[PDB]
Amino acid sequence: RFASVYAWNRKRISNCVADYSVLYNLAPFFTFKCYGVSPTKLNDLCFTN
């Protein structure tokens, strides 16, 4: 279950390395467009938080 829009939850992730193979491989995903960086360069960067 997800929280409602007006009371959206925020989940904090840190102290781990993120793998983006599975996010792009999920069937029911319709749109994904990233402005600041290319969608394919999520695994060659360091995330402060």
Partner: protein, 49 residues
Amino acid sequence: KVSGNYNYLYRLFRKSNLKPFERDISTEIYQAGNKPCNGVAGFNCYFPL
């Protein structure tokens, strides 16, 4: 232009880096997925301009 000047374009993806003063304009479709993408842009393959 107030109505929107869209005759100027750039790119968001290229297959490889280029040498200085390079000379060609190839506007072929660019893909990101392992499977080849041909014809129209689809999943993991989008219009590069």
